[PDB]
């Protein structure tokens, strides 16, 4: 009921079921990440035959619709901004790489552009190993104090999860020059996350 | 003394047949030679690219026009697709006669050619030229081969936005040779020009593209017209025309708008820069929804001096008129602009592109010009006079003053006789009255010690229709040779389409039958041999406006004014069973003020078919070796070589 | 007229396009009535704030001094009208919305065929284009035929 | 309601109405030319009425 013809794979997708305006750039992934998760459940359980066969056409239309919309927010240097002509956000750039790495095969995307995207995220890693955003889309960590500790750790963990999904894009061309840099960047950030997790006092999120 | 001639188009397109011309001269009376010609990799171990076409040449059939297939799969096996330094391949002819009688050190003879993956013809069009973010856009692409017949090969179609990023990429193999696709522009899109590009999947550089503008929503409440009194401004020392315009504002149903019109004047550069006159902005009230604005010659010169310019400083700029009409009852306003008010030196313009710019000493030089009236191309009945300064070596230069009246589509062809002892020719062309359009050209004579020249004379220089017979005169000039035949060939769309010989007479005439294969323009190349030296010259013939094979006719019988909703019946008639792709476009988006990206016509189709033409000139003739290069060919006789193009372009 | 000349004369004091754009934003009247200095404090670049503040202060002072003076006439009534806006030197907006392309299709036609169609309503006359694709005879471009749709009432 | 419309002109016609339903009503305005003129047009649109 959640991922079927009456759910995430409806002709209008979950975007019409969530019932909120989706003008912002991050909201474009509501056409992508839920549709991808709905396809993963039906693929691994071999349940496409139960639904009407036109659902697969609905799925690829939603993913291509999201890819076509989100690419309008792409900056020249491979980063993504919350709005058009707005400053680039490290968090949103990570979210795009985490989702578009899975969807690029079926939408006709370019692996070269995603390799350019991950290189920009690597340039935002600080000396400690944490990542930094000059204008994050989400703040969240409020009411509970020590906001800088939670934000930097949550952002770093979110970028690493995005960079790991980006490893699936690489082939033989980027196996030596770029893939080794990303794996080292993930290991450098995991050292930051490891000491902060061992030190404790992190928020629940 | 005996030799084998090999010419071929300068660039071979992979996947489509390459027409190869082979000819031999000065052979014994009963000689018969045989061999093979094929493409081979100039790198590696010089692996031949599979297909070999054999030739058998006799003294009674000394020429052969061959078709080399050159398939894609064997081009990859040859290793050309991998590349190294440049995209070049060599076409080589193998015959024992090279070692058997010419005694050339190698049994192989060939020349280097560039290669390209471009093949076929791809036409693509959108359902509208101008869209708004949020609108769906339908586009269709047509696939045709070299012979303008439907092609079923797989294509890859891609759409990029204003910033050049792909938003869609699809691969489709298409029977019936028409592919249609829909998509919706996201509403947050930045305004600009998007581009759709379609190419054959195997042809990496076979791309054809159409582009459209996506812009923000704007619909005027009432129509606004800016109408100049004269559609151009004449600037001549001591004279300046009236410079007057009318401004009209009315609602669509007809009632005139009651309001005030604010008009401002400036200069519009050809790059796009706008420079306003700060003191000459004017405000006038509309009467009957209209207003008449006049800018005096005194005010205009005062305006130019305000920004430190003179009347002489005008250089093809446009007088810019920007009008804002504000309604009096409502207060809302609409704007309009006039960007087509050029400063011109004459009501006519001269096109001198068809001039050879290469002299043939001792033979008439044809001055070819086209006179346009800016509003339209054909300026017929206009007197055009040429002043020809013939610079002789040593003696005083002599002047020829010839004139003729343009006719037909505004063309003119003025013979200018030049002696055999000439250093350079300087031409001064003056067309139109009272204010003439001028064009000045200087041509240098070929080297004086040349081994003779060939003159190709054309009696009536009017473009022939498809089906007419054109007669061309071959006239050798200079020292004179002992040759037995003239050799001529026809080049159309970058391929050798015809080749033949013509015997040497006191007056030799070649009759060419122009059919559909030769449209829209073809090169006529002719040559003879004088003591192991080729002597050649070429002439480009433009074919008159052609028509389809068969026909497609659309007709709505009777009066074509219809009301809303009621049915209308359209008649479609065609020569065979065919796929008829239709489309209805509003006349507003195609109006004068809009840079509309005009739709397809037969002119666009013929121009697209001519994209494979390799001719980088109007005829050439300075040197017999490079007159084949100026026609688009690469050629070698075993003694001299063509240099081969640096790039698929005309430097 | 006098308002347009003075604002353009103020714009003439700034030669850089960055300064002109920051100045042109200043002379534009905000919808809600925020104080000029209060409004000018928002812009993030001080190199943009300095011309923005100067043009905003000059525009508001000039607009209030010229206020209530316009609409001359023999009548003793006074028409209420909004404050004059700067007429942009940016490009004018050419119409961008046009009716959708009906009859965008491809039909199999054997020798000849007639299509019965229902005409969408509009006041602009349109022209129909056509492309014929034949396997034996190739591509052909039809000459456009005009169809003028009009409304009596 | 008899309304005179001049040539090449537009004339608004004022009708008064107040919705008492709670769903949606399709209202249709009918215009017909008098005398022997067959001119006339009708427009039907749905008016969404909310609580
Ligand atoms: C098929 O695709 C090729 C590859 O993009 C197209 O060639 C490109 O053509 C454009 C237009 O001429 C070139 O841009 C121009 O460059 C010159 C020199 O810098 C500049 O002065 C112009 O203002 C313009 O920017 C572009 O360089 C060229 N691509 C390459 C790699 O050279 C070709 O036009 C396409 N053909 C069709 C029919 O779409
Ligand atoms: C059709 O409709 C039009 C518009 O409503 C009618 O025009 C009106 O015609 C009358 C009679 O001619 C005009 O009144 C006269 O005006 C003149 C000055 O123009 C004056 O000297 C006369 O004493 C008289 O008052 C009236 O002004 C005019 N409407 C407008 C807006 O100017 C027309 O009459 C109608 N056709 C018929 C056959 O009734």
Token pair in block for residue B595: 């840079």
- Whether the ω angle into residue B434 lies within 30 degrees of 0, i.e. cis, is yes
Please tell me the CATH code under which domain A1-205 is placed: 1.50.10.20
Rounded Cα distance between B582 and B174, Å, is: 19
Angle, helices C2-11/C46-65, rounded to nearest 10 degrees: 160
- Whether the ω angle into residue B520 lies within 30 degrees of 0, i.e. cis, is yes
Rounded Cα distance between B70 and B286, Å, is: 70
Question: What's the gap in Å between the CA of A72 and the closest CA on chain B?
Answer: 6
Chains that touch A (3 or more CB pairs under 8 A): B
- Residue B111: closest CA among B629, B486, B618, B619: B629
In this structure, chain B runs to a length of 651
In the reported structure, the alpha carbon of residue B259 is separated from the centroid of ligand 2 by a whole-number distance in angstroms of: 23
Residue of B nearest to D8 (CA): B254
DSSP lists the bridge partners of residue B417 as none
Rounded Cα distance between B90 and B111, Å, is: 5
DSSP letters for B97-157: HIIIII--SSSEEEEEEEEE---SEEEEEES-SEE-TT-EEEEEEEEE-TTS-B----EEE
The protein residue whose alpha carbon is closest to atom 1 in ligand 1 is B207
For B145, B586, B590, C148, the CA distances from B555, given in Å and listed in that order, are 30, 18, 21, 14
- Burial letters for A78-108: b for 16+ Cβ neighbours within 10 Å, e otherwise? bbbbbeeeeebbbbbbbbbbbbbbbbbeebb
**If you search the block for the tokens 């988006």, which residue do you land on?**
B589
Rounded Cα distance between B218 and C96, Å, is: 5
Token pair in block for residue A131: 């990542």
Handedness of CA A71, A77, A78, A82 (dihedral sign): negative
User: Is residue C60 classed as helix, strand or coil in its secondary structure?
Assistant: helix
Is D8 within 8 Å of chain B by CB? yes
Q: Tally the C-alpha atoms within 13 A of residue B361's C-alpha that lie toward its C-beta.
A: 21
Instruction: Evaluate whether C119 touches C148 at the Cβ level (below 8 Å).
Output: no
Long-range contacts of the stretch B24-29 (C-beta < 8 A, 24+): B24/B57, B24/B62, B25/B62, B25/B487, B25/B529, B26/B1, B26/B2, B26/B529, B27/B2, B27/B59, B27/B62, B28/B59, B29/B59
For B116, B571, D36, the CA distances from B566, given in Å and listed in that order, are 53, 17, 20
Token pair in block for residue B421: 């002892």
Mark yes or no for CB contact B189/A74 under 8 Å: no
Instruction: Evaluate whether C100 touches C93 at the Cβ level (below 8 Å).
Output: no
A70, exposed or middle or buried, with CB in 10 Å at 0-12, 13-18, 19+? Answer: buried
Rounded Cα distance between B538 and B490, Å, is: 10
For C61, C62, C72, C73, the CA distances from C69, given in Å and listed in that order, are 14, 12, 8, 11
Instruction: Return phi, psi of residue B163, to 5°.
Output: -90, 0
**If you search the block for the tokens 């169809």, which residue do you land on?**
C147
Rounded Cα distance between B97 and B547, Å, is: 47
Spell out the domains of chain B, with CATH numbers in brackets: 1-118+631-651 (2.60.40.1930), 119-218 (2.60.40.1930), 219-345 (2.60.40.1940), 346-447 (2.60.40.10), 448-548+611-630 (2.60.40.1930), 549-610 (6.20.50.160)
Pairing status of strand B437-444 against strand B424-431 = antiparallel
Query: In ligand 1, which atom is closest to the CA atom of B209?
Result: 39
Cα B36 from chain centroid (whole Å): 36
Instruction: Evaluate whether B612 touches B13 at the Cβ level (below 8 Å).
Output: yes
Instruction: Return phi, psi of residue C11, to 5°.
Output: -65, -30
User: Is residue B71 classed as helix, strand or coil in its secondary structure?
Assistant: coil
DSSP state of C70: -
DSSP letters for B226-247: EEESSSSEEEETTEE---EEEE
DSSP letters for chain D: ------TT-------------SSEEEEEEEEE--TT---EEEEEEEEE---
Rounded Cα distance between C83 and D9, Å, is: 31
Angle, helices A179-199/A111-122, rounded to nearest 10 degrees: 40
With contacts defined as CB-CB under 8 Å, which chain B residues touch C124? Answer: 586-588
> Which ligand lies nearest to the CA atom of residue D5 in the structure?
2
Rounded Cα distance between B19 and B65, Å, is: 7
Rounded Cα distance between C27 and B23, Å, is: 78
In the reported structure, the alpha carbon of residue D35 is separated from the centroid of ligand 2 by a whole-number distance in angstroms of: 21
- Residue B178: closest CA among C50, C139, A74, D51: C139
Angle at D8 between CA D7 and CA D14, to 5 degrees: 85
Resolution of this entry, Å: 3.8
Mark yes or no for CB contact C106/B560 under 8 Å: no
Chains that touch C (3 or more CB pairs under 8 A): B, D
DSSP letters for C90-150: SPP---------TT--EEEEEEEEEEEEEPPP-SS-EEEEEEEEETTTEEEEPPPEEEEE-
> Which ligand lies nearest to the CA atom of residue B118 in the structure?
1
**If you search the block for the tokens 């298409």, which residue do you land on?**
B174
Rounded Cα distance between A193 and B238, Å, is: 83
- Where do the H-state alpha helices sit in B435-481? none
- Residue B624: closest CA among B113, B105, B7, B61: B7
Instruction: Evaluate whether B438 touches B430 at the Cβ level (below 8 Å).
Output: yes
Spell out the domains of chain C, with CATH numbers in brackets: 1-92 (1.20.91.20), 93-150 (2.20.130.20)
Chains that touch B (3 or more CB pairs under 8 A): A, C, D
> Which ligand lies nearest to the CA atom of residue D11 in the structure?
2
- Burial letters for C97-112: b for 16+ Cβ neighbours within 10 Å, e otherwise? bbbebbbbebeebeee
Beta carbons within 10 angstroms of residue D50's beta carbon:
7
Interface B:C, ≥3 CB–CB pairs < 8 Å: yes
Mark yes or no for CB contact B167/A65 under 8 Å: no
> Which ligand lies nearest to the CA atom of residue B648 in the structure?
1
- Burial letters for B481-519: b for 16+ Cβ neighbours within 10 Å, e otherwise? bebebbbbbbbbbbbbbbbebbeeeeebebebebeeebb
Largest Cα–Cα distance in chain A? 53
DSSP lists the bridge partners of residue B428 as B387, B440
- Where do the H-state alpha helices sit in chain A? 13-18, 33-45, 55-70, 90-107, 111-122, 147-166, 179-199
List the domain boundaries for chain A.
1-205
The answer for residues whose C-beta is within 8 angstroms of residue B184's C-beta and 6 or more apart is A65, B134, B135, B136, B137
- Residue A71: closest CA among B213, B192, B136, B190: B190
Query: In ligand 1, which atom is closest to the CA atom of B611?
Result: 38
SS (H, E, C) B374-435: CCCCCCCCCEEEEEEEEECCCCCCEEEEEEEECECCCEEEEEECCCCCCCEEEEEEEECCCC
In the reported structure, the alpha carbon of residue D4 is separated from the centroid of ligand 2 by a whole-number distance in angstroms of: 13
Instruction: Evaluate whether B436 touches B384 at the Cβ level (below 8 Å).
Output: no
For A20, B216, B267, C37, C51, the CA distances from C21, given in Å and listed in that order, are 35, 20, 21, 18, 9
Cα D29 from chain centroid (whole Å): 3
Quickly count helices (H) and strands (E) in chain B. Answer: 5, 45
Instruction: Evaluate whether B350 touches B377 at the Cβ level (below 8 Å).
Output: no
Instruction: Evaluate whether B155 touches B180 at the Cβ level (below 8 Å).
Output: no
With contacts defined as CB-CB under 8 Å, which chain C residues touch D9? Answer: none
SS (H, E, C) B306-332: HCCCCHHHCCCCEEEEEEEEEECCCCC
Mark yes or no for CB contact B170/A108 under 8 Å: yes
Beta carbons within 10 angstroms of residue B134's beta carbon:
13
Handedness of CA B622, B626, B627, B629 (dihedral sign): negative
Residue of B160, B207, B650 with the most ligand 1 atoms within 8 Å of its CB, for mutation: B207
DSSP state of A11: T
Beta carbons within 10 angstroms of residue B398's beta carbon:
12
* Cβ of B209 less than 6 Å from ligand 1: yes
With contacts defined as CB-CB under 8 Å, which chain D residues touch C152? Answer: 39
The answer for residues whose C-beta is within 8 angstroms of residue B646's C-beta and 6 or more apart is none
* Cβ of B409 less than 6 Å from ligand 1: no
Instruction: Evaluate whether C129 touches C142 at the Cβ level (below 8 Å).
Output: yes
Rounded Cα distance between B111 and B92, Å, is: 7
Rounded Cα distance between A41 and C122, Å, is: 50
* Cβ of B101 less than 6 Å from ligand 1: no
Question: What's the gap in Å between the CA of B255 and the closest CA on chain D?
Answer: 6
Rounded Cα distance between B164 and B159, Å, is: 9
Pairing status of strand B166-172 against strand B233-236 = unpaired
Q: What is the dihedral of CA B201, B202, B208, B210, to 10 degrees?
A: 10
- Residue B576: closest CA among B200, B38, B149, B218: B149
Angle, helices A90-107/A33-45, rounded to nearest 10 degrees: 50
DSSP letters for B537-566: EEEEEEPP----SS-EEEE--S--EE-SSS
Rounded Cα distance between B587 and B593, Å, is: 12
Residue of C nearest to B561 (CA): C148
């Amino acid at each position: 009921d959640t991922l079927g013809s009456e759910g995430a794979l409806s002709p209008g997708g979950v975007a019409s079921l969530l019932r909120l305006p989706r003008g912002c750039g991050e909201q474009t992934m509501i056409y992508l990440a839920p549709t991808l998760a709905a396809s993963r459940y039906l693929d691994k359980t071999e349940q496409w035959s139960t639904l009407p066969p036109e659902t697969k056409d609905h799925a690829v239309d939603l993913i291509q619709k999201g890819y076509m919309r989100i690419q309008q927010f792409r900056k020249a240097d491979g980063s993504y901004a919350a709005w058009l002509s707005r400053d680039s956000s490290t968090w949103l750039t990570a979210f795009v790489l985490k989702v578009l790495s899975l969807a690029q095969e079926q939408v006709g995307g370019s692996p070269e552009k995603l390799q350019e995207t991950s290189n920009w995220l690597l340039s935002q890693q600080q000396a400690d190993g944490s990542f930094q955003d000059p204008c994050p889309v989400l703040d969240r960590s409020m009411q509970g104090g020590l906001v800088g500790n939670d934000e930097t750790v949550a952002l770093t963990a979110f970028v690493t999860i995005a960079l790991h999904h980006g490893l699936a894009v690489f082939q033989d061309e980027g196996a030596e020059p770029l893939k080794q840099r990303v794996e080292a960047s993930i290991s450098k950030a995991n050292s930051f996350l490891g000491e902060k997790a061992s030190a404790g006092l992190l928020g629940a999120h | 003394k005996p030799r084998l001639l090999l010419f071929s188009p300068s660039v071979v397109h992979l996947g489509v047949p390459l027409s190869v011309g082979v000819q031999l001269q000065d052979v014994p009376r009963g000689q018969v030679v045989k061999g093979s010609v094929f493409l081979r990799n100039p790198s590696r171990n010089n692996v031949p690219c599979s297909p070999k076409v054999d030739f058998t040449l006799s003294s009674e059939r000394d020429f052969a026009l061959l078709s080399l297939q050159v398939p894609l799969k064997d081009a990859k096996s040859c290793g050309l697709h991998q590349l190294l330094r440049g995209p070049e391949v060599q076409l080589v002819a193998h015959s024992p006669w090279l070692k058997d009688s010419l005694s050339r050190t190698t049994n192989i003879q060939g020349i280097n050619l560039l290669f390209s993956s471009r093949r076929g013809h791809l036409f693509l069009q959108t359902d509208q030229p101008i869209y708004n973010p949020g609108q769906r856009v339908r586009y269709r692409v047509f696939a045709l081969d070299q012979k303008m017949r439907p092609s079923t090969d797989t294509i890859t179609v891609m759409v990029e936005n204003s910033h050049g990023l792909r938003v869609r990429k699809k691969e489709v193999y298409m029977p019936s040779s028409i592919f249609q696709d829909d998509f919706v522009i996201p509403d947050i899109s930045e305004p600009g020009t998007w581009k759709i590009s379609a190419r054959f999947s195997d042809g990496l550089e076979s791309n054809s593209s159409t582009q459209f503008e996506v812009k923000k929503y704007v619909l005027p409440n009432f129509e606004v017209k800016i109408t100049p009194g004269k559609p151009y401004i004449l600037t001549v020392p001591g004279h300046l025309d009236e410079m007057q315009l009318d401004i009209q504002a009315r609602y669509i149903y007809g009632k005139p708008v009651q309001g005030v019109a604010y008009v401002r004047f400036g200069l519009l550069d050809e790059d796009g820069k706008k420079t306003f006159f700060r003191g000459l902005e004017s405000q006038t009230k509309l009467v009957n929804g209209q207003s008449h604005i006049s800018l005096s010659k005194a005010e205009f010169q005062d305006a130019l001096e305000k920004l430190n310019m003179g009347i002489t400083d005008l250089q093809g700029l446009r007088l810019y008129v920007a009008a804002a009409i504000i309604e009096s009852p409502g207060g809302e306003m609409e704007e309009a602009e006039l960007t087509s008010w050029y400063f011109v030196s004459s009501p006519f313009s001269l096109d001198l592109s068809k001039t050879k710019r290469h002299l043939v000493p001792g033979a008439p030089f044809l001055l070819q010009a086209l006179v346009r009236e800016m509003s339209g191309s054909p300026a017929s009945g206009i007197p055009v006079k040429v002043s020809a300064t013939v610079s002789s070596p040593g003696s005083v230069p002599e002047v020829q003053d010839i004139q003729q009246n343009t006719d037909g589509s505004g063309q003119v062809s003025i013979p200018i006789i030049i002696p055999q002892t000439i250093s350079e020719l300087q031409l001064s062309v003056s067309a139109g009255s009272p204010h003439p359009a001028i064009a000045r050209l200087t041509v240098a004579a070929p080297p004086s010690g040349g081994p003779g020249f060939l003159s190709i004379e054309r009696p009536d220089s009017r473009p022939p229709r498809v089906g007419d017979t054109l007669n061309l005169n071959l006239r050798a000039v200079g020292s004179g040779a002992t040759f037995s035949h003239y050799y001529y060939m026809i080049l159309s769309r970058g391929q050798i389409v015809f080749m033949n010989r013509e015997p040497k007479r006191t007056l030799t005439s070649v009759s060419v039958f122009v059919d559909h294969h030769l449209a829209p323009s073809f090169y006529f190349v002719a040559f003879y041999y004088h003591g192991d030296h080729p002597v050649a010259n070429s002439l480009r013939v433009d074919v008159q406006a052609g028509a389809c094979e068969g026909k497609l006719e659309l007709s709505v019988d009777g009066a074509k004014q219809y009301r809303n909703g009621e049915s209308v019946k359209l008649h479609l008639e065609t020569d065979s069973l065919a796929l008829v792709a239709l489309g209805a476009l509003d006349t507003a988006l195609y109006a004068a003020g809009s840079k509309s990206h005009k739709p397809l016509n037969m002119g666009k189709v013929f121009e697209a078919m001519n994209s494979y033409d390799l001719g980088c000139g109007p005829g050439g003739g300075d040197s017999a070796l490079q007159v084949f290069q100026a026609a688009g060919l690469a050629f070698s006789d075993g003694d001299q070589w063509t240099l081969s193009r640096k790039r698929l372009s005309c430097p | 007229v006098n308002f347009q000349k003075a604002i353009n004369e103020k714009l003439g004091q700034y030669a850089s396009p960055t300064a002109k754009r920051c100045c042109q934003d200043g002379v534009t009247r905000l919808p809600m009535m925020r104080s000029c200095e209060q409004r000018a404090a928002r812009v993030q670049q001080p190199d943009c704030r300095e011309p923005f503040l100067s043009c905003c202060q000059f525009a508001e002072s000039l607009r209030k001094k010229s206020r209530d003076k316009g609409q001359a006439g023999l009548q003793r009534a006074l028409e209420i009208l909004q404050e004059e806006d700067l007429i942009d030197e940016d490009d004018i907006p050419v119409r961008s919305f046009f009716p959708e392309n009906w009859l965008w299709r491809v039909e199999t036609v054997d020798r000849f065929q007639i299509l019965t169609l229902w005409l969408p309503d509009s006041l602009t006359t349109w022209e129909i284009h056509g492309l014929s694709l034949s396997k034996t005879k190739g591509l052909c471009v039809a000459t456009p035929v005009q169809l003028r749709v009009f409304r009596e009432f | 309601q008899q309304v005179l419309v001049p040539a090449g002109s537009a004339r608004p016609v004022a009708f008064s109405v107040v919705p008492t339903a709670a769903a949606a009503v399709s209202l249709k305005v009918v215009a017909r030319g008098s005398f022997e003129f067959p001119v006339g047009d009708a427009v039907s649109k749905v008016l969404q009425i909310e609580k």
